[PDB]
């Protein structure tokens, strides 16, 4: 029998929120893997490491916000395994930025499908939640990553040895 | 060929550190599940939720410290799936504290086996690392959880309705 | 049946901790006796009295830390009589410093045997506890006492009347 | 031959002061035992533990004040064994408060006999010392302990599980 | 006849501490040589010079800490000649970082042998001293040097003329 | 071929500066040995130890200033072994002060020969450098040491047991 607070919250939306929680946790774990990679002594880009660690924590925050939403609407959180990232070795700062861009666009696509579903179920609170706390942030993150990829490519990374070093210092070091 | 920094770091220790990283991440995810449970409208113990969320973040910090150790010694981090917790529904504040106590003692046991291995491989830096940043913290956490279980039991939880409410306010608030 | 928190804590270690608690309490009582002695009107060295009173309180703190350890690991504290010091009359500042040096080295030896036992039982938390909070402090205290004995002897104490007076003022004041 | 400072200080008073020093040390050790008991993981009342630890330190201070008195009057301190407390296991917060009340009243009785002796020996400095620094403090401590016993009993301790917990928080947690 | 403070301190440990003191002094002198090299007008990398001068002073501090340990345990310090570094001319910032990495790993190896010896002699105070003040610092220094070597190599040093200049400004400045 | 900055700097001056660098380093090591000696538990004069440790660091600073001069004038620093001090055991505070006085006067004599050489080679910058940063400091140090020797002797050291103790407290404290 439904939660005492549950109103206008379709079971399909509940399931899709649980899937999105898992995806945010997965993204957090991918960024954590990237951060570990740039901390290796044979890579040693401290500001790449800092950048992706920050991203990892932000993705965890996103997941926790979705869990709060789920309880607030009277849904029930069902956690699933967090799959390991597709790679141990991220090959270069440029490659990691490109993979992060791909990841962020996949997360964005999942959010857009979630918003489609909430619109189809006439759930304006959920639509507004997604728009307010997620869509704008994704567009910003995607644009940032695209900018970084563009600059790294123009500087000549990975092959120009100086490029990732100086990008680490100037763009990611403030 | 070995990392330029690698010295006196046995492949067995490297593997065991990777396993411990996974275990800390798993513990973080268990505590996150508990925290979500006490945020439910039909449970609604805000300070239980806060407590376990804090524990979740601390476990993530422990994992990140182990990853830093791994890179510092020239090992290579290999991540694995983080398995889902054994339960969605943690049944009561007392039950969650008991499960957390069990979890912390399993993590402690894994750390003790890691210290055994480092001692067997004559790796004093790793032994000292475990002693300094892990063993003492585990003993403290286990003692705290035991205390909470004891008080909850004596108050009459879960069946005495007032017990978890007042414990939430007094001890965890 | 064992405490809910007890893990990897051997009954022999528990017993040895209780013995060490008693020894620390005994040391506290010895230093208290010394302090009383230098407060006598026919001795009247106020800074010797202060020094040994400080040592007495520090030894009590050491005992209380061991009791906390015992409860933290799930052992049970069993107190015993605190025997009276071997002497009422400590004869001179030099003699008291020499007796304190002997006492501190006996306490150190007991701690070293405790660390041996913890190592034999593969109890790294207890080993680390002893190393961290006890061994270093003992080495420091022993060195300090040795220094004081050396200076007092060189100054000509007890027989040079000025020596303990000036040592009281300069070193201990 | 007597101390150069000794005046109007009877050997019987000196002996009785040494006995009182031992009793204060014993009381300190009893309270230390109680404090250890409430720190056990299967008891776990932190404010009971704090309370009795405070009492233990206060009893040690009382003993040290008596030792100072002894040297001030030119008596000589003779220490004796400090006997172990009668119990390892203090059974409950109520039981420990009751045992502490009994202990404090025994210490008070010893102080009253000491004051009787000082009065019989016409030693007004010692009488005043006892009155000023000891008797009033004992009456206060006894009244406090009686109050705590009364409240614990009325709350239903030990059998009402909530009683010692809430007393720990409200009365002893200030 | 032994020092009044000496307890549980084996003659082999005393000798090994004296050898380690000499090694730390030697390391200090090597880093001083490197620092002088980067101050040459035909090299002129001020932040390399600063970096290695800092390292030189830190190595001297390490030696002085070992001397304090030696006196604290009642051993006797016997100094030996400090041999001159193997090179006057360190060839480049990358080469100096590589030689420093090699040096730090040799010092680490000597510390590990010292810890082995202290463990074999059952000297927990000395083991803890080494772990606490030396091993962790060495692992950190080795990791740092490895990082610097990695970055310099990737930037194209020594042959890319800009590399050491910009590394001097960004990483070491 | 000469350094681009080298002007009016004779090869003999360069060699003599390298010798002086070695002598300053040697002096630093002698004072370090003295400092260690007064830290022994059977000597235990803390302010003698502090005093000579300060002197050791000052001598190292002198050496580093000479190395800077060498690079500034375009000479090349060639380091040599730093020989061990002539003694492990400095026997007493008075004896150590006397040996320090002898050492400082030998360093002064070497500086005077260096100034003679610079004057003979018509190198006014080097002459001024020696006068400004070295000669005056040496005269001051020699006078100070002479004062300390005089007072220690008059107090009756080493044989008057109180003398070095009180000198440690009053003059060096």
Author numbering:
A (entry chain R), D (entry chain J): 4 to 177
B (entry chain A), C (entry chain C), E (entry chain B), F (entry chain E): 4 to 176
Article sentences:
Here, we expand upon our prior work and demonstrate that one such 200 kV microscope, the Talos Arctica, equipped with a K2 DED is capable of determining structures of macromolecules to as high as ∼1.7 Å resolution. At these resolutions, water molecules, coordinated ions, defined backbone features, and holes in aromatic and proline residues can be clearly distinguished in the reconstructions. Our work demonstrates that a modern 200 kV counterpart to the Titan Krios (i.e. a constant-power two-condenser lens TEM with an autoloader) equipped with a DED can produce SPA cryo-EM reconstructions of ideal biological specimens to resolutions better than 2 Å.
